[PDB]
Amino acid sequence: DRATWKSNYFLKIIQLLDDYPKCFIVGADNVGSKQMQQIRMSLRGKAVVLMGKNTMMRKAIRGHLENNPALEKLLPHIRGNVGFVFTKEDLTEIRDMLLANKVPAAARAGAIAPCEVTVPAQNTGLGPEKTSFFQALGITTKISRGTIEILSDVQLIKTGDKVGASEATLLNMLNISPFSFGLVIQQVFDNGSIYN
Amino acid sequence: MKTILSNQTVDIPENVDITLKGRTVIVKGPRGTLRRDFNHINVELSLLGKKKKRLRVDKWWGNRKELATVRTICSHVQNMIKGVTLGFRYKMRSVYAHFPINVVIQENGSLVEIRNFLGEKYIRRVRMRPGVACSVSQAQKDELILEGNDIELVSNSAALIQQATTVKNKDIRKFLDGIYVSEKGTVQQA
């Protein structure tokens, strides 16, 4: 079945490369399956998104290169976790609708945080049994109105560094928005053209 | 099966001078000299380039057992290069449940005294290997820095401290006291 599935990928990529003259190569960050489901459903009206092995992409491209030259321009750009999005709509509107649907990604434990986040001093609303986590992270907190209350704003994690499990689960419990990100366009390809 | 040849090459950085006195490699760099003889292994050591300064280890007609000595020699030489360029710094975090551990550094960081390990009266005294310097941290609460050039000696000193801090007749899964090597890195981080 592996050979048949690879063959199916070949026919799929050649058919869609022939069908859509406008394709953008997009870099996939630490994006989840649910994020991808949301993106596909958002773009279900106009665009179609495919991703796979870069080597498979490049091999199919080189195989179809005689039938359609000028696709060799995409060849020294299939690097890293990237992929194709096929569209027929205008550049800035597709770019707008791709930057518009960026999920507020939760802080996954063990990952690097790209954003510097400081939590405020507010009525958290949590029950007075989650205080052990505030004690573990090193925040002095008091009970106000029968709920947890932080006296001062405190930073939690800097930029470009690893995150801890307790630090992450506290933010999940507070349900605040951590660093958020999504798939980002690397380049575009309009009928034999390369742009930034 | 005697493979005709197995060879491996290590690149020498520009500011490092390596001399071969037989199988005795002398690596000289900004941090000093590391010397080590590989006379227990029969290999063909040679220096090739003039700007690259490659060092090749060759072993001819080697069976399975001695075919693994080539990478061992290359890794030891790379360790010598790392030691004389960036040095080795082992950071050990002394962890204790209840009793704080009093670590006293004696003369020029060559002697370490562990006083209150598990709250007892016997004082552990550990002598670091020659050329290895010990320190008590300033950016960290309970941390020891072991700096040196010979990775062998540095890590052996770290193991000496760690195995001096040993719990006996107790559930070691419960009693987690002692000093453990939190991380292994370099000086100057270059």
């Binding site: 205080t131 004690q135 002095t140 907190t141 009970i143 001062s152 | -």
Partner: protein, 161 residues
């Protein structure tokens, strides 16, 4: 200070969960050091203190007395940072010079206690003499010949009954 606050938080959450509301017939029951409903010391050595004593004697150092000690205890305890170099309380852990400020509780309650402990336990006789003279501690006879932890018990028993 962190451990003290941990104990305070744990007691507070206990009484919050297993008690009635702040609007309850008993009222507000959560204990705050600024309210002076939590104390420190050691009963074995015969000495103890609260937030009231240090605040009162610092006000005397600096009707109206109750007001002064009451609103000074709030600066005595909390996440408030006091610079001994500045001589005025601050609400920022970073000075305009960028130097970190020790918090007020450790700065002007725990610092003298730590200093007298170290002087007595390490037998620094001139240090203990200076500390007694600065703290106007009144020792008695038969206490002036002892040393170590019994001298510590004596000095602490007289200074913080």
């Amino acid at each position: 200070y962190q451990t003290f606050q941990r104990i305070v938080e744990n007691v507070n959450v206990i009484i919050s969960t297993y008690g009635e509301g702040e609007s309850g017939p008993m009222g507000n029951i959560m204990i705050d050091p600024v309210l002076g409903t939590v104390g420190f010391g050691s009963g074995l050595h015969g000495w103890a203190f609260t937030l009231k004593q240090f605040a009162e004697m610092y006000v005397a150092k600096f009707a109206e007395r109750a007001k002064k000690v009451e609103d000074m205890m709030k600066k005595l305890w909390g996440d408030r940072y006091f610079d001994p170099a500045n001589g005025k309380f601050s609400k920022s852990a970073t000075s305009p010079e960028g130097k970190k400020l020790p918090r007020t509780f450790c700065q002007l309650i725990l610092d003298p206690i730590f200093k007298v402990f170290d002087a007595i336990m390490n037998f620094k006789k001139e240090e203990t003499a200076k500390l007694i003279e600065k703290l106007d501690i009144k020792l008695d006879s038969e206490d002036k010949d002892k040393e170590g932890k019994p001298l510590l018990k004596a000095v602490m028993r007289r200074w913080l009954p």
